[PDB]
Every structure is written in C-alpha cells, then in structure tokens.
C-alpha cells in the first residue's frame with residue numbers, strides 16, 4: 001500500500017501532503033500525523049498527512065517543491081509510510097540557494113524563515129527542500145543540519161539561522177538533473193535484469209539463502225560503444241541504498257606500477273566493509289586483457305590480483321561487482337568463468353521506440369517547438385546509438401544558433417534578447433543533424449510478367465508459413481523447403497527467386513556450381529558447408545542454386561576421374577540439406593538448365609520435393625513481359641505488343657529484354673541526331689520511333705532451339721506419367 | 733552419414749588428391765580395427781551406394 | 791586483355807560473370823575488355 005502515484009497539490013504547502021480517506025485509513029494512520037516519503041534517487045522526506053476527498057485513492061496530492069526534493073515527476077511512484085519517534089527539533093540549520101539570496105536586502109530568516117516556521121509544527125529531514133514566497137524573489141531553503149538528526153519538528157521556540165555558505169545553484173541543479181532509471185531509454189528490459197541480478201540479492205539476501213543458491217557476485221555489460229553502460233552505472237549509483245564506489249579503467253592505468261593493485265585492494269576492502277555495497281568497473285577490458293597476449297607483465301599482475309580478490313569474497317559480503325566493456329572478447333577468458341563475471345548482458349542498439357525515448361530524454365532540457373516530431377527523426381535513424389542521438393540533438397541546437405549568426409554579433413559584449421527569444425530549434429535543424437550524422441532483392445513480383453501459377457505456388461510454399469504460423473502449428477506439418485526450377489534459359493527463374501525473397505523480406509543468397517567446384521581436394525565441400533552456414537547466419541534466407549546440373553549429377557555414373565570428387569560434392573549437399581530440415585526459415589530454391597542429369601537423391605521429398613517446369617512464355621505472358629520491359633521506357637502508341645508477342649514464338653524473356661534494350665539504344669541514337677539538330681538550330685520526339693523497333697529486332701535471334709524444349713517436355717511427361725494416382729478415391 | 737564419400741574402394745580415383753582419399757581410408761581402417769583397446773564406440777554408417785565402399789571397411 | 795587466351799564455360803568465367811552482373815549496378819565504373827578473337831569467348835560476355 002505504500003506505493004502511490006505522485007499527484008498535484010491544490011492548496012497543500014511543502015511540509016504537508018494529502019491522502020484520500022480510504023487510503024489513509026488503509027495505513028492505520030491519523031490526520032495530522034507525521035509521515036515519511038521515499039522517492040526516486042533515494043530521496044527521503046517527512047511531512048504532515050492531510051485528509052482530502054479530491055485526493056485519489058491511488059494518488060497522493062503533493063507539491064512541486066517536494067517533487068524536486070523527492071526528484072519525482074507527475075505519475076511517479078513514491079512509497080509512503082508512518083514516521084515514528086519524530087522528536088521536536090532543537091535547532092535547524094538551513095542553507096538557501098545562491099540564486100534566491102541575490103537581491104534580498106533584508107535578512108532571509110526575518111523576512112522568510114521566521115513567519116514561515118512560526119507555529120509551524122513541521123517535521124523535516126536533512127537535505128529537505130522547501131520554498132517560501134515573498135519579497136522581490138521567492139526563496140528556497142535546504143535543511144543541511146537537523147537537531148536531533150534525522151527527523152525534527154520545528155517548534156516556535158526552535159532557533160533557525162540561514163547563516164553560512166549558501167548552496168551554489170549549479171550544485172543543487174546537478175542533483176536535481178541527476179540521472180535515474182527513467183533518463184536511460186531503450187533498455188528498460190536490461191534495467192529490470194540488472195535490478196534482478198544486483199538489486200534483488202542486496203535487498204533480500206536471505207531469500208537467496210533459503211533456496212540454496214549463491215547470488216552472482218559479478219556481472220558484465222557488453223555491446224557497441226555509446227550504448228550507455230556508464231550511464232547505467234550512474235543510475236544504479238543514484239537509485240540504490242547499497243553503497244556505490246567507482247573504479248575507472250583509465251584511472252587504474254593512471255597509477256604507477258604497483259599502485260593500481262593497491263587502489264583495487266582498498267576498493268574491495270571498502271566494499272566489504274560497508275553493508276551492503278556495489279562496485280562498478282568501467283573499461284574492464286582495458287585493465288584486464290588476455291594474459292596470453294599481454295605487452296607488460298604488470299597487466300598480468302593486475303589481472304591475477306583481480307582474479308584473487310574476485311575469489312576472495314565468500315558470497316557472505318553481499319557485494320556485487322559490475323563491469324562494462326565495449327569488447328567482451330578483450331577481457332581475459334578466466335573472468336568469464338563460473339564464480340565470477342559469468343552473467344553477461346548485451347545492451348544492443350536501441351530500437352525505434354527506444355531511440356524515440358532517448359531523443360525525448362536528451363531534448364527535455366532543450367526547448368521544443370510545435371512542429372518538431374521526434375518520431376520521424378527516430379524513424380530515419382535506424383542505427384544511431386544513444387551517444388549518436390545526443391550528438392544529433394546538440395548539433396540540431398547548433399543549427400538553431402547558426403541560423404541566427406547573421407542576426408547575432410559575437411564581437412558584442414552582450415547578446416540580443418529579441419534574437420534570443422526568437423531562437424529555438426526547428427525541424428530543419430534536426431534534418432541537418434540527420435543528414436550529417438553517420439551510424440533483400442530489388443526485384444518484385446510486379447516486375448515479373450506471366451507465370452501466375454508459379455507465383456502463387458511460390459507464395460504458398462514460402463510466404464504462408466510466416467504469414468500463418470498458427471495454422472501450421474495446428475495441423476502439425478512442417479512446411480516444405482525444396483523447390484527446383486527447370487526450363488529453357490532466360491525464363492526468369494532467378495527473377496522468381498528474387499521476387500519470392502523480396503515478398504517474404506528474407507535475405508537472398510545466390511550461387512552457382514562453378515563458383516564452388518574449385519580444384520583442391522576438400523575445398524569444394526568446404527565451400528558448400530560455408531555457403532549453407534552463411535544461409536543459416538542470415539536466417540530467414542532464400543538460398544538459390546543456379547546451374548544445379550553442374551554441381552549435382554548422377555553419383556553412380558560419372559565419366560571423368562575428378563567426377564569422383566564431384567560425387568563427393570553431391571554427398572556434402574545431401575548432408576547439408578539434412579541439416580536444413582532443422583532450419584525451416586531457410587528456403588532452398590534450385591534452378592537447373594537441364595534436369596535429366598540431376599541426382600535422384602537431391603529430388604527426394606524432404607530436400608527438393610517441389611519440381612516446377614518453367615516453359616517459354618505464351619502470347620499472353622509475352623505481352624506481359626513486353627509490358628514489364630516497357631514500363632521504364634515511354635513508347636509510341638502505334639506499336640502493338642500483341643503482334644510482337646505473336647511474332648516472337650521462339651524467343652524467351654531474355655530475348656525480349658535484349659529487344660527492348662536495342663530498341664531504346666536506337667532511341668538514344670535518334671536523340672543524338674535530334675540534339676545535333678538542336679545545336680544547329682542554336683547556331684525532339686517524346687516516344688520511341690518505329691523504325692528503331694524495325695532495326696533493333698534484326699539484331700535479335702532465337703536464344704534456344706526447339707529440340708532442347710522438347711527434351712524439357714520429355715522430362716515433364718516422365719514426371720506426369722510418374723504421377724499416376726489421379727484415379728484415387730477412398731472406399732465408400 | 734553418406735559414408736560412401738569418405739569411404740571408397742582404394743585406388744578407385746587416381747586424381748582424388750593424389751591418394752589423399754586412400755590415406756583417409758587407411759586411417760579409418762586403423763582407427764576402427766587396429767592395435768588399440770576397443771572402447772564403447774559404436775560406429776554407424778549410412779550409404780546409398782554400398783558396392784563402392786571398400787571391402788576392408790565392411 | 792587477351793580474354794581469348796582464357797577461352798565454353800568454366801569457373802573463372804563464372805566468377806567474372808557474377809562480378810559483372812553485380813557490377814552493372816554501379817554505373818560510374820566502366821568495364822572494357824579487349825580480346826583478339828571474339829568467336830571463342832563465351833557468349834555470356836556478349
């Protein structure tokens with residue numbers, strides 16, 4: 001019940017807080033009682049509880065000033081408890097801020113403190129902040145000294161003196177703007193994990209004792225630089241009751257030989273002295289590299305001493321040591337073992353919403369106009385780490401100032417107020433920042449013309465499992481992962497593979513047999529294993545094997561001596577695909593120019609079970625191919641693509657692409673003539689002229705003879721005659 | 733798996749690494765049955781072409 | 791130079807084929823091949 005949501009106070013002063021009647025009853029509390037408030041950044045205060053109906057059950061009506069004292073904002077969670085044994089204060093010493101005391105001709109105590117604390121009966125704590133209105137400037141007071149410590153009620157007979165050294169404005173501001181868990185963005189999950197491995201053992205060590213475990217004494221943070229590991233150290237420093245101490249890797253290296261070890265030993269001694277304690281080690285890889293590869297023996301000494309003191313604690317001191325590294329591999333491998341920095345956390349690059357949060361955090365102090373939208377900037381900056389985002393914000397503010405360099409004058413002793421109030425950041429500044437700062441196939445189904453059945457089948461095999469995983473899990477059948485494309489050359493099999501990869505948004509890897517065949521003994525099979533491993537790394541992926549006939553042949557019969565090695569290659573592929581049954585996301589598509597010699601074992605169901613015959617495009621598909629090729633080129637209306645498709649009976653898709661290439665080349669040539677004519681006029685046709693089609697087609701010939709095509713039909717008819725279960729109906 | 737690749741009739745392919753395949757076969761022969769105490773190592777082979785496998789392997 | 795010395799298809803011509811296919815994306819670099827006799831060079835080059 002102690003948790004409550006920070007809520008505004010309508011009339012309550014700083015030394016009083018308000019609760020709802022049901023909530024105040026729930027705590028077994030009386031009206032006017034002294035209460036203790038705990039808020040973020042380990043900020044503790046004491047106030048007087050009040051009854052109010054407007055105050056919500058889950059909200060506490062409480063002011064701005066104590067919010068600053070508690071370092072909390074609206075909506076923040078603070079823990080409220082009864083405060084017992086709140087003795088009346090004998091004497092309080094308060095240090096006001098430097099800014100507030102300026103211009104106050106009269107004494108602060110007489111003008112402000114004396115009437116404020118007359119019959120106050122207010123309980124206060126060391127470091128408590130309160131505000132008093134009056135004079136030319138409202139005055140802030142901070143209670144540095146309390147007597148008796150720590151909780152003291154200000155009675156009228158209590159003497160109050162503001163004499164001493166007033167608190168500097170920057171010193172109070174730094175604590176006010178000090179970091180907590182909210183200031184770090186994009187790693188809330190990692191903050192929760194770090195709380196679990198670190199904060200949880202410290203708050204409840206007996207809980208770890210009961211279950212028969214020893215808490216992880218040391219934890220490691222690794223990832224790209226700038227992700228905020230030191231910032232996480234700052235946050236855990238501010239918001240943990242456990243005593244926090246600093247060890248800096250550069251600071252460790254700064255000491256003389258034989259003094260870094262002394263500093264670290266006294267560090268662990270101090271940590272084990274206080275109960276509890278947390279140590280953080282930034283740049284652990286800097287002072288703890290591998291002892292196998294080390295330039296100086298002193299570094300080996302410091303690594304060994306760190307190991308010895310790491311084993312020195314016996315899990316009873318309850319001190320957790322934290323380490324941050326940009327390169328975890330540089331850290332000595334011993335530290336990664338058990339009983340020591342075994343627990344690793346990777347602070348990956350922030351996502352879109354995380355980087356949005358980081359941008360908001362970085363820009364909260366800066367002014368933001370109505371036009372600026374941080375979500376857009378986050379959308380464009382895919383890869384910037386948090387430090388890059390901070391630099392982006394700073395250079396956006398720099399553009400804001402730069403746009404006024406014509407208005408402002410540096411030589412002046414003072415700056416203009418008009419330009420200053422006109423000065424702010426706009427969208428253009430963040431655009432410049434985005435431009436300056438530095439952190440799948442193109443082919444689509446619309447590009448392909450014809451072969452609609454093949455397109456639908458490819459969508460069925462690959463796109464549907466990722467679209468509908470639940471349906472596949474329900475029917476309990478693993479999706480097929482094998483497609484073979486066989487047909488005459490230049491019919492868009494590679495286009496089909498690229499299109500399906502683009503539609504499914506998976507990495508596309510394409511390779512051919514001669515790329516793999518090589519000359520050394522085991523090299524080709526190693527290449528096959530490497531390409532399959534590469535497909536695994538880029539999962540989900542579409543692995544495309546072009547010229548499958550060259551790489552896969554009938555093992556039983558091969559004329560050449562080296563064909564035996566070729567046999568070996570095929571075997572490797574077989575085994576690889578047995579490993580590819582595990583990776584359902586990796587989809588293997590094999591296009592072969594001639595499928596008769598393809599090994600029967602590779603076409604076995606479970607490796608390449610789908611066989612697709614890609615024939616020559618018909619008249620309709622030829623029209624579609626001409627449309628696709630002529631999308632980019634404006635064309636005259638006189639040409640009839642239907643007639644072109646009808647005439648080009650023996651041509652493939654590549655033939656038509658070369659056709660359009662030559663046609664538009666002669667279009668360039670007539671453009672040369674037109675521009676020469678324009679130059680003569682100094683001293684145009686919108687679309688392609690028809691005689692260019694006339695001449696361009698003459699250059700083209702038939703790519704593939706019909707005999708190979710009838711061979712393809714013979715293979716397809718063997719496949720069809722094999723599928724002889726058409727006359728199949730279950731009994732009754 | 734696919735033992736017929738690593739195991740062949742010795743001398744079948746002259747250009748298979750200059751006898752490196754035959755040396756591999758001899759090494760496998762010594763490692764399966766040689767002058768070492770047999771451990772609890774059960775060797776399973778799978779092949780589609782058993783007639784090409786070395787008779788000493790079988 | 792002397793592309794005919796290499797020369798229907800083999801490993802090296804396939805490497806160069808894939809490289810020029812990927813290289814067509816970069817228009818700025820200009821690819822020139824001078825061979826003495828073009829009859830024997832692979833038509834995929836053409």
Ligand SMILES: Nc1ncnc2c1ncn2[C@@H]1O[C@H](COP(=O)(O)OP(=O)(O)O)[C@@H](O)[C@H]1O
Pocket residue numbers: 183184185186187225226227228229230231232282324326358361385386387388390
């Ligand atoms: N998630 C985040 N939220 C807010 N600021 C961040 C975040 N990540 C990084 N930063 C900023 O970027 C900097 C990252 O530095 P850091 O990675 O801690 O240095 P090192 O790697 O040397 O310890 C910090 O100063 C911090 O202000």
Ligand SMILES: Nc1ncnc2c1ncn2[C@@H]1O[C@H](COP(=O)(O)OP(=O)(O)O)[C@@H](O)[C@H]1O
Pocket residue numbers: 447448449450488489490491492493494495591624625628629652653654655657
């Ligand atoms: N249906 C089609 N639509 C558009 N272009 C096509 C089509 N079929 C083939 N092509 C053209 O043929 C050329 C080569 O095709 P390719 O992908 O090499 O076929 P294959 O997979 O048979 O080798 C491509 O540049 C492409 O422009």
